[PDB]
Amino acid sequence: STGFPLELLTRPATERLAYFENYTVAHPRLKEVYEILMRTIAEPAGASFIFVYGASGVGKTTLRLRVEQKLTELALPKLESDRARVPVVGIEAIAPESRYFNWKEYYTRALITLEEPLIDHKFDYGVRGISRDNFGKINVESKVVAPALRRALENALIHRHPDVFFVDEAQHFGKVASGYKLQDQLDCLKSLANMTGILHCLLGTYELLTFRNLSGQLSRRSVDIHFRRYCADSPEDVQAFKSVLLTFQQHLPLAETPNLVDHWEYFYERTLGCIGTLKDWLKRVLSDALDREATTITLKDLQKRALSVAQCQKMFKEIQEGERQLSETEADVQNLRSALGLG
C-alpha cells in the first residue's frame, strides 16, 4: 500500500487533520521550481536580486519552507566550527497589517528575525541604541534613526553572511504612500544587498512583475523564476494535474477512497491550476464532511464549499495579464538580435 496506513481510521478526526495538514505532495512543477531555486541560491554569481513570480495559492510558500528546512539541515553540520551564520532567513517584513510599508519597521524586523535564532553575546553592533542583553535577546529602542538601524542591519548581515533573505508577500513593497518612486525603494534594497552581499529572493504573486526591469543595474543583477501554474492546454500538464488529484485521493484520510477523479475538469474551474487553492478547498471540504462523520466525499460536498465563479474569473484575468506580461517568444529574440546588430 503506497497510500496512508489503514491505522489512521480509529483515531479521532483531530488526528486525521493533524496528519493531513502537514502532509505535502510533490507535483512535477514543484520539483522543477525547487531544483531551479536551489541551484540559483547555491550559486548566486553576483546577483543582488532574485524575483520569484507565481500565482496565489499554488505552493510558493510550501516551496520556501522546504528551501529553509533543506538549507538548515545542510548548514547544521557546518555550524560546529563556523560561528554566527544563520542558514536561512524567511519573513514577510512588508506592511504587517499596516497601512503603508515602513522602512524603519522593515529594518528593525529584519534585525530581530536575524538575531533571534542564536543566543549570541559577543556581537557589537555599530550603533548606540541597539544592543544585546544578558539573557541573549536583541534589545531595540524606538529612538534610533533609520540610518542607524541601517548601519546595524548591514553590520549584522556582514558578520552573519546568511545564504538567502527570503521575503514573502513582497508585492506590497509598492505601498510607498505618496510622493515616492518605486525605483528608489529597489535602489535601497539592492544597495543593502550590495554592501552586505546577501541574496534577496523576493517571492509573491504576479504583482511583483511590477519591478521586473526598472534600471539597467537592476536588470543585469536580477534572476527571474516564474512558478507557472497548470494550464489545461498542455496534455501532459493535464495528466500531471489529474495524477496530483489521484495522489490526494490515495493519501486522503478516509475509510474508503472517494470518487473525485471524474470531476477533474470541474476541479479546474475551481482550481485554475492553483494547487494550493485546490489543497485548501479539499481540506475544508473534508473537515466539513468529517464534522458530520461522512466516510466519503461526494459531488454535493464539492459543490457546498466550491469557489465562486466571479472570484475565479477575476483571478483568471489577473493571471492572464501577468502571463502576457511575462511571455517570451521567438519574436522577442529576433527583435533583440535586430537591435544588437548581429547578422
Added chain:
Amino acid sequence: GVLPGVLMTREIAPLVNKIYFQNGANRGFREIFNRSQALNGMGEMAADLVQVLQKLTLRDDLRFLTMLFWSNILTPRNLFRTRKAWCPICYQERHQNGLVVYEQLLWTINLITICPQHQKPLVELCPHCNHESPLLNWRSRPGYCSKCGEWLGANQCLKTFTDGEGSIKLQLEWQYWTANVVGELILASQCFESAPSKENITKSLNIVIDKVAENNAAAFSRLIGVPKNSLWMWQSTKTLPELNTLLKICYELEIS
C-alpha cells in the same frame, strides 16, 4: 513591580508597631537590610515578619517557609550568612524550564556550601562586579545583583575546585552529607507534628554516652574533639549544641 526595599518601607514597616520600624521607614530602613539574615532566624523579628506577611497576603503556611519550626533545637550562633548565596546552575535551569526563580532557604545556612541538585559550591560574590550584597537590599531581585543588576546564573559557573586527591574527596563527601541531612530535616519539617525539645537532646546524649562510651564523657569528647566543658553543657544544661557540632556528632554516630 516594586523594589523590595520600597515594599518593606511603604507596606510592611508602617504595619509593624515597633518604634524603629516606623522611624526607619522614612530615612532609609537600613536596619532591616544590614540584618536581613535575622528575618529568616528563629527569633521575634522573623516571627513578626511572618505575621506581617500573613496579614498582607492572607496565607496559611508561611511558617513552613522559614525554619522557625525549630526555634527550640537550633541556635543563631554562626549559622546565617551575611552575604547572599545562590546556585547559578539552578537559576538557569529554572529560567530555561519556564519556572520561577526562587531563593532557597538551604542557601542561607552557613553550614551549607554546595548545591545538592547541581553539585557545585554556591557563589558568595557577584562575578561581574566584585561587591558584596546582603540577603535583602533596596533593589534585590531573584536572579539579579543588588548593585549591578545583571543575571548571576550560568549554565557553567566560573568557580571550580582545586586539584587534589588527598582530602578534597573527603571534604566533598562531608559537604554532601551535611546538605542531605539539612534537606531531609527541612523535608520532614512538614510531616512532623511538632519540633523536638531541648530535653530530646538531653535524653539522646544520655543514650549515646551510655551506649558506646559506657557512661563517660572524656572518651566522647576526645572522639569528637570538642572540649569536655561543652559536652557537659550539652548533656546537663539547656544549651543547644551548634548545628555543625550536632551533625559532627551525628557523623560520628553515622546516623542522620
Added chain:
Amino acid sequence: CSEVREIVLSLNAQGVYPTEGRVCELMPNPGCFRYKQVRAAFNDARREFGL
C-alpha cells in the same frame, strides 16, 4: 539655616534669582538640603523676599 539665609539674601541683593541649585553652588557642603529644615528655611526666605 542661617548661612542659607544670608546666601539667598546676598544673591538677591546682587540681582540673580536665588534658586536651590545656585544657593547650593556657593555653600561648602551642598548636600545638607536633605534635612527637612534647611530646605524649609530656604523656601521661607524666598517667600519672605517674594521669590
Added chain:
DNA sequence: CATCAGTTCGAGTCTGGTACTGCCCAGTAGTGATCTTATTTCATTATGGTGA
C-alpha cells in the same frame, strides 16, 4: 597516692533586637530653536470634437 573524670567561675566571641547621622542626585515638566515628514495646493500639459 596522683591520674583522670565530673563540676564551677568567669571571660571571649557572635548576634539579634532596637534606634540614629551626614550628606546632592535623578526624574519630570515648562519654554525656545531647529530641523523633518505624511500630506495639501499652484501652475503647465496632454486629450477631446465641431461650427465658422
